[model samples]
Target: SKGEELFTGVVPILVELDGDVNGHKFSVRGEGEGDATNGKLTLKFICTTGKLPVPWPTLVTTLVLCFARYPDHMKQHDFFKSAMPEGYVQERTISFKDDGYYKTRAEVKFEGDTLVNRIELKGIDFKEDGNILGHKLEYNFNSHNAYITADKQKNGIKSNLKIRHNVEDGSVQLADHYQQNTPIGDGPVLLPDNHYLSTQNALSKDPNEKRDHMVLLEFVTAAGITLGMD
Candidate 1:
């Protein structure tokens, strides 16, 4: 077969969750080839927006959402392996970013649950006013529900930030401030009014005192991670 297409066709299908998530639609319509070694599988998936629940905060929410879509990326990896048909190797270093003062590296591997998504603060540097302080920041994640401890020190002053999220009761404790998440829509919509956490419910220095803090509300539509094929 010289310059011949293997399995060249379009697959149009729709899957609507038949139960509580009914009306939640997922569709895949794209092209692929039978001889995948020399071929390609281009699949574009579309689903209802509100089906997936949102996690809280700017950073932790990013982690949960990333974990949700991670399987797709894993499958993409599997297909990539098939394209070359390699040995029993299962590891990938996704992408790394560096911006003069900051650096981030992401590596994906297998081991927990279906998989585990984790993060840590490796280093830190602060440039404020006319002062410059460069220090090493260390952190850890317990991650059963979600526990994070971050610390940094400069000029003998130590600052620590602790965050704990209890997936069981849907509660989060960021330092002395507390937030709760309520589920709705028979889905996990992390939008502003959907599955959201209040930035107002906070605790003061005293255990019995309620601390009220002013928070800026920014009107936003959505936030997410973009996956692209390189």
Candidate 2:
């Protein structure tokens, strides 16, 4: 713990739905890539850190510069949308911390299996306004095993994820965490919105929408606190 530095980044892992008896899978592994070309898509990511190795010192130094020299540059961006292949996807941000430090959260998104996006955040902050002077504390996650329960933080936190997908083979996506009001460990509640207001086989601009991400944040953040989606 003496020289341990925080190499903040996002990690993708394979999982198994194993009937929930032996615990649903939700762990990180860089084994297999996603499947965008075909109907199914497998997810995975890098769990790299600058510690006790070749790239650790160099990596940490760069992170310090970005967080200190330039913090106004912190902003949320899609990892892969214009680059990569057809389904190319990636998302990473560089944000400074309140006390003048940098953190990074790697992002890897895919439509199917086209190597759509893979983002590597040099340094950035997710919370604490002081982290990035004029930047807003914001973050987004891409997890097929996501759920919609009362305690969102616990369910959403990848480190303690309750669902897992397999990388060797493929798997089916039953639904998102927000689709149902299932209670997670200690995460936030699944606030509702009108964006994903879908029914048996229909869609609409109905306020009865159950899984609107934007509205959900507004609900939990309270009346005064909220989020304006793009």
Candidate 3:
């Protein structure tokens, strides 16, 4: 029963034992509700700057922004000119539980005409909690095979995709390689970031690969984690 924590930049996470990380992949499953006009594009930003309660930008940084969307993608238009406070990143990040979770993140670098970066991490498990008792599919993720997709289109809109979450496994219907935990059928939910790449930025490699509209880019850390719901 998480609230509208997304875009607020306050992601939810889980943790366990066994030093909890060693090159793992992630996936999400949940419900989403939003205005789907203009095709209602969504962007998920992976904080390469790393840390929870990600540092919201300041005014000075705004001064350097060439485009309003790129810098203050979610910032209010009226507050667009406001400079971000000094040590803004450090300050916000400090209050967040660094000990909680954060193995990987996918960011929405750009999406079609709309350029956005927001948070949608609801039932995330960055550390692969022990509760994950597997059932079926298992795939290895590297910089090669992790990401979001437009194929999961729904509600006559693109971002309206629903899937069953099995972080240990891939989304059931998407591929058989997914870990098995029975079909949980997640409803319409926004992604944490636009995409999740395993090892490299697919767009940078072939510029052509970059979707003129939007791409799920994992522009940092080759290995990390994403979450699934209970």
Candidate 4:
């Protein structure tokens, strides 16, 4: 039979664990705050292990504390001027439960960057019945005029989107369907509400930028586990 366990707080934020593992009693406590830069995290673990009889089991414990330093703009000359500018670190944390296929309940929070603006996209009840082309897709967020499709006429892609700002009733709508190719001389297309959207090639004078559009998505997962026996 499995041993009893106690879990508290959300993972990666504040976590406390107490349970039995392989006949050994153990406990773990961890907490953290702030972003990757200027953040601090601490973890502690205690456990009783070793054989019984003549030599009793020993109680072992360990403590770990970590502190992250902010990026040094002066030391790292090109750090602030590169693709990812200073104060533009995009951080996204997503918690979801898989219910087979496209059915899932997920909560996503985006922070650090201006694009995401610390928006918490929650209450996403995706359904498998929803269809996009031949793929399944569904969401329960605020309604907006956003879409993406291939443009055979211009040999490019058309995209339209709306991003809600952190301020109250602040939002921006961008569309590139009318003009596929934007000249370098002409800046970003101006839209209503003093909003503008520009494509990569439109802002760049380099001929290489006039190529096909590329979209990339990345996923990463990290987990920690401790096991002991007596």
What is model 4's C-alpha RMSD? Answer: 25.5
Error of 1 at 27 (Å): 40
Off by over 4 Å in 4: 1-84, 89-123, 132-160, 163-193, 200-230
User: What tens-digit string does per-residue lDDT give for candidate 4 at 105-173?
Assistant: 111111232111111112133233322111222111222232334344432233334322121224321
After superposing candidate 2 on the true structure, give the runs of residues whose Cα lies further than 4 Å from its correct spot. Answer: 1-31, 35-116, 125-230
Q: Give TM per candidate.
A: 0.19, 0.20, 0.18, 0.16
State the lDDT of candidate 3 residue by residue for 1-230, as single tens digits.
Answer: 12122223312221111111223322222111122111111222222222312111100011011011212232221111121211010001111121222222112222332223222222233223321212232222223333323223331101111222233444431211211011112333322234332222221122453322212222222122333452
Off by over 4 Å in 3: 1-21, 27-100, 103-109, 115-129, 132-230
Error of 1 at 117 (Å): 2.3
* Top-down lDDT ranking: 3, 4, 1, 2
Pairs clashing within candidate 1:
7-34, 52-188, 53-188, 53-189, 54-190
Q: What is the C-alpha lDDT profile of model 1 across 14-106, one tens digit per residue?
A: 112111111222221111112222222222112233322111121222121111111232232121122111111111121111211211122
Measured on C-alpha atoms, candidate 2 has an lDDT of 0.20
Query: Model 3 compared with the native: what TM-score?
Result: 0.18
lDDT of 2 by residue, 1-230 (tens): 11001112222223211111012112112222322111122232222221111111111111100011101121111111112122211111212212332222333222343222222333222233321232222222122221112224432111111212121124311111111122212222223221111111111122653322111100000111234553
Cα lDDT of model 4 overall?
Answer: 0.21
For each candidate, what is the lDDT? 0.20, 0.20, 0.21, 0.21
Error of 2 at 206 (Å): 44
